[PDB]
Amino acid sequence: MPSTFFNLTMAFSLSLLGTLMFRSHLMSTLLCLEGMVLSLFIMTSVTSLNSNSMSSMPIPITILVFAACEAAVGLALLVKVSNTYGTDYVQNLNLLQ
Amino acid sequence: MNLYTVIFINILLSLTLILVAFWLPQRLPFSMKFFLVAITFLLFDLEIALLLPLPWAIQTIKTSTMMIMAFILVTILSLGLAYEWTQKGLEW
Amino acid sequence: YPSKETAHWKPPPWNDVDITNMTLNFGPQHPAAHGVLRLVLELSG
Amino acid sequence: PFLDIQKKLGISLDRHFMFLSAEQPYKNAARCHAFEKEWIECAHGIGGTRAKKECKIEFDDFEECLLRYKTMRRMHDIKKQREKLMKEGKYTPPPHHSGREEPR
Amino acid sequence: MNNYIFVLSSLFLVGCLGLALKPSPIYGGLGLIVSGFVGCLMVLGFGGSFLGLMVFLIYLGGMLVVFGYTTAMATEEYPSNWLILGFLVLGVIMEVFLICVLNYYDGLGDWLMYEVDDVGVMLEGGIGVAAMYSCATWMMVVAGWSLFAGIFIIIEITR
Amino acid sequence: MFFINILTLLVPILIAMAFLTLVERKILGYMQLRKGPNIVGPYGILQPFADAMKLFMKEPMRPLTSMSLFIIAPTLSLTLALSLWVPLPMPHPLINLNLGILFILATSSLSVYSILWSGWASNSKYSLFGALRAVAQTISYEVTMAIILLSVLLMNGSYSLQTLITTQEHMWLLLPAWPMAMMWFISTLAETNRAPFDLTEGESEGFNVEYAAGPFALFFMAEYTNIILMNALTTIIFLGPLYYINLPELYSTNFMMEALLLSSTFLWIRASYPRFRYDQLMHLLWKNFLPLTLALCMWHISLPIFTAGVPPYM
Amino acid sequence: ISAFLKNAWAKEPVLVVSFSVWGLAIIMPMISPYTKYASMINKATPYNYPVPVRDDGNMPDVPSHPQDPLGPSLDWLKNL
Amino acid sequence: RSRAEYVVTKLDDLINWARRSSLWPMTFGLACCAVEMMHMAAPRYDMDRFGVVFRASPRQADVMIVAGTLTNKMAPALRKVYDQMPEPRYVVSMGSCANGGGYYHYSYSVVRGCDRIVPVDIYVPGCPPTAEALLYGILQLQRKIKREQKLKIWYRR
Amino acid sequence: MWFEILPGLAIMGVCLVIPGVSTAYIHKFTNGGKEKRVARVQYQWYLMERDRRISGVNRYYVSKGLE
Ligand SMILES: COC1=C(OC)C(=O)C(CC=C(C)C)=C(C)C1=O
Ligand code: SF4
């Protein structure tokens, strides 16, 4: 289990480096952002499962339910952006300078 | 495993067919409704995920709380739907 | 304090606001139509 | 916590399930239910500053009921030993470790 | 079979590395759909059953699909994906690099399932997730509020 | 042995999958006052094999397009559809899965991608427009499709398809829950993109537009196998074939009869009805069916409790 | 109000039925001669071993053979 | 037998039988000879009976039946669609208006024949070529395919 | 008439019963003449493996009162 947890944790860091190093299209980011939620969901489920801690399984899912809406909001902002610029490049989001 | 055996035969059968196929014959996002629908879909999906444990939860000793909870979830989402049907939503 | 390439910035707008519908041609061969109708149609979705 | 509207109202919406020894469904105790209990009935009335130095036996154990790493080091070491000896044939696995048995 | 998990874990990192090189919006969606498949298997590998298929049922086809769905509508435009693939392979062996060192100095299956509770007819997951309705009925309410809030919140973002 | 049991359960279905197209091109025929294909072979029995060979031989033109999201899409479509027959519980199943119906629901859901991937891969306007609408109704229909099953399960007690053989030892689940059968049948018609609900790839030529020869065939095969599988799921979940533990084949014999008749029904539906409009289709699910399903979903959490009929787990 | 229900039953004949069920499911449980059984029938189903207590004495617990007339019974479940 | 030549012939035949039994046509439906084809598809003379599908898109179409005048504006399209079909493809010209120019041969907007824009394999004659005649023409395409010997030429090449 | 749609169906039916009869006899022949036991919950496996450990090396082999 410890080895698998290491992989999942680095997966989250590789997904961390991704969302903290943008490149053009935002939908990539939001997509990356989701890669973390999967890694968190997998790790939470894994330890809960090998701790036989059934009282906590509710969490693995609460994490997904909140993460899904979180993403819903994220995509509506994205659609709003390629309606105002139509190209969804993190590049044009600089009016606030 | 037993399942693996079946599945890899399943992929093999399909990859075999595509190969044979190749080897033998020798931008407007107008419909944010589209997007809207799709937003709904997950909100409903996620909701399903909350309802998916109900078969195990039926056997819960409480029962009263089970139903009280489940009925509240179904009702609040349906109201979400209702408001999708009040403004210009779900009317593509 | 405006420096070099910092004066480029000019004040933000006071109002806080800044300043073919995927036209497709209906097929002539299309089973729809009587065989020769090139209906150009600009369609928003 | 910051605003204890829960204790005041007497409600317990967030405390019943914070530790592995909390009520598990169908009374299926989790791994370590024994230890965590021994750790937290120890650190009850004794604040943290003093739940961290004298109640260290119970955490050092509960840190090994769940991580279960000191074990790994034991077993992993044992493993290597067998390997070396076996390579020179110094050690050989009995039928028990050869897949021969019928306990019932 | 042993270490079935580490292999998978390794595949999960590969998929995350693919999402991290930020490949084209939908080519990588596949990437997620791949590691989501992989994570579905791992949870299903530790005995997890419902939790495992939930992700496959919800994150896999529900979210992710909706994600690409939107990608087609917006951010479907194009301009080095093969270079990304090229460098992807670069780090794949590099994971082994890390793996080699770890193995270099410290064996799965020694333990994947920690206590089996062999005599038990009420031992799976989904009994725990169904505590949303007994003894953990606050997680259920707050999840419900989030969904109800989502319908109201999103309509303005579109409008 | 297990391998032999993989040939059976696959080939047999593939051979049957071929004979469905034939029984489609003849039942539609006589309904329309025409013999249908009888000249190749005896009574058209060799007809399905004939175009299969023509399809594979013709050039799989790769458009001036992706080359993977193009070849992954038919492989995925055939793989998921043939895969979903793995857990089906004819008499006793091949791989009995405790959470079986979630497997079937999840595997179906994955097929929507193949449509999305093929539409993006083609890189022509007809394909992308068709895929976006196609993906929309598939997942739209999935939402009622899933809730309709959750109502069923709660009266079955478990997710395992094997339990329903013991639930339906006295009466079909159509008698109770008929209101959902209809709604399962219509949703089964949408998810197999069959006629009443077959807007994609219509006379308007969606995700076969650029697909010819071998790729065309694989989805193609997939659709028809699905056509059967979904009908078969109707024939286990709602029409429960009589089960006798002493002789397991009368279960499969009646499963054979009910599956063929309900498979015949969507053939009969196709010839009989005009195709619905894209929004007409979603108007049905979100307005007409989803409120019916969500409410009848609650009735199926209440029917158990106050009728003291909570189903036995296991 | 009759019209609000007579045309809504002629046209829109789905939401009417839809709501009706929503309610009927919100009522039957409240009023029924069996609702109570569900929490019992499921409570009774014995899944986890029933651990026996020490007989300090003066107890009504069934001693020895569980068949002793003392204790809980499910004859309510029987002949239900 | 085993001498490969025989083996080859048999194989070719199978290949020919498959293409000749299932020909999926596409009907540009220029003009009227289209009405006489819809009649073939119709019940008196079922095309499907023979394995010809009533309709098909260009990607999945084995034979193109050009029914009707191929006017100069439609001439670039015909070609496109002919060029968008598979490697084993065929063209059955139908109608005097498409075999040659027909009543409109001397016009300024009519191509004098489709065989000036697409290679044509069977020419079905008649102003509204009778539906039976098209059926005869589709059947002669089937005899044309039967005779084709692609693999034996490969072997002898 | 309509007599002819039957040929095709016959070959469909026959190909939809094979699977159900096949899977249900390759089980009763690869499990010693007895249905393949269904291990749904830990306890069913235990007794299943306990039985394995009981005799021979296969579960279908069932030692009786005479043991
Ligand atoms: C008369 O106009 C025409 C059509 O629309 C009315 C067709 O659909 C078709 C297509 C019909 C068949 C036989 C596939 C043809 C041929 C045509 O020309
Ligand atoms: S040939 Fe006779 S029928 Fe065919 S198109 Fe020209 S005129 Fe119309």
Curated annotation (Swiss-Prot), chain E:
GO terms for molecular function: NADH dehydrogenase (ubiquinone) activity. It catalyses: a ubiquinone + NADH + 5 H(+)(in) = a ubiquinol + NAD(+) + 4 H(+)(out). Its EC number is 7.1.1.2. Pfam families: Oxidored_q3. It is an enzyme of class 7 (translocase). The chain crosses the membrane at residues 1-21, 38-58, 82-102, 135-155. It is a multi-pass membrane protein. GO terms for cellular component: mitochondrial inner membrane; mitochondrion; respiratory chain complex I. It comes from the Eukaryota. Keywords: Electron transport, Membrane, Mitochondrion, Mitochondrion inner membrane, NAD, Respiratory chain, Translocase, Transmembrane, Transmembrane helix, Transport, Ubiquinone. Its main location: mitochondrion. GO terms for biological process: aerobic respiration; mitochondrial electron transport, NADH to ubiquinone; mitochondrial respiratory chain complex I assembly; proton motive force-driven mitochondrial ATP synthesis; response to cocaine; response to hydrogen peroxide; response to nicotine. It is found in: Mitochondrion inner membrane. Core subunit of the mitochondrial membrane respiratory chain NADH dehydrogenase (Complex I) which catalyzes electron transfer from NADH through the respiratory chain, using ubiquinone as an electron acceptor. Essential for the catalytic activity and assembly of complex I. Belongs to the complex I subunit 6 family. PANTHER family: NADH UBIQUINONE OXIDOREDUCTASE SUBUNIT ND6, NADH-UBIQUINONE OXIDOREDUCTASE CHAIN 6. Core subunit of respiratory chain NADH dehydrogenase (Complex I) which is composed of 45 different subunits.
UniProtKB/Swiss-Prot annotation, chain F:
Signal peptide: none annotated. Belongs to the complex I subunit 1 family. Core subunit of the mitochondrial membrane respiratory chain NADH dehydrogenase (Complex I) which catalyzes electron transfer from NADH through the respiratory chain, using ubiquinone as an electron acceptor. Essential for the catalytic activity and assembly of complex I. GO terms for cellular component: dendrite; mitochondrial inner membrane; mitochondrion; neuronal cell body; respiratory chain complex I. PROSITE patterns: COMPLEX1_ND1_1, COMPLEX1_ND1_2. GO terms for molecular function: NADH dehydrogenase (ubiquinone) activity. One of its GO terms (biological process) is mitochondrial electron transport, NADH to ubiquinone. The chain crosses the membrane at residues 2-22, 69-89, 99-119, 135-155, 170-190, 227-247, 249-269, 289-309. Keywords: Electron transport, Membrane, Mitochondrion, Mitochondrion inner membrane, NAD, Respiratory chain, Translocase, Transmembrane, Transmembrane helix, Transport, Ubiquinone. Core subunit of respiratory chain NADH dehydrogenase (Complex I) which is composed of 45 different subunits. Its EC number is 7.1.1.2. InterPro entries: NADH_UbQ_OxRdtase_su1/FPO (IPR001694), NADH_UbQ_OxRdtase_su1_CS (IPR018086). It catalyses: a ubiquinone + NADH + 5 H(+)(in) = a ubiquinol + NAD(+) + 4 H(+)(out). This is NADH-ubiquinone oxidoreductase chain 1. It is found in: Mitochondrion inner membrane. It comes from Mus musculus. It is a multi-pass membrane protein. Its main location: mitochondrion.
From Swiss-Prot, chain H:
GO terms for cellular component: mitochondrial inner membrane; mitochondrion; respiratory chain complex I. Its main location: mitochondrion. It is an enzyme of class 7 (translocase). It is a peripheral membrane protein. It is found in: Mitochondrion inner membrane. Core subunit of the mitochondrial membrane respiratory chain NADH dehydrogenase (Complex I) which catalyzes electron transfer from NADH through the respiratory chain, using ubiquinone as an electron acceptor. Essential for the catalytic activity of complex I. This is NADH dehydrogenase [ubiquinone] iron-sulfur protein 7, mitochondrial. It comes from Mus musculus.
UniProtKB/Swiss-Prot annotation, chain I:
It is found in: Mitochondrion inner membrane. The chain crosses the membrane at residues 1-21. Disulfide bonds: none annotated. One of its GO terms (biological process) is aerobic respiration. GO terms for cellular component: mitochondrial inner membrane; mitochondrion; respiratory chain complex I. Pfam families: MWFE. The keyword Protein transport does not apply. It comes from the Eukaryota. InterPro entries: NADH_Ub_cplx-1_asu_su-1. It is a single-pass membrane protein. Keywords: Electron transport, Membrane, Mitochondrion, Mitochondrion inner membrane, Respiratory chain, Transmembrane, Transmembrane helix, Transport. Accessory subunit of the mitochondrial membrane respiratory chain NADH dehydrogenase (Complex I), that is believed not to be involved in catalysis. Complex I functions in the transfer of electrons from NADH to the respiratory chain. The immediate electron acceptor for the enzyme is believed to be ubiquinone. Complex I is composed of 45 different subunits. Belongs to the complex I NDUFA1 subunit family. This is NADH dehydrogenase [ubiquinone] 1 alpha subcomplex subunit 1. It comes from Mus musculus.
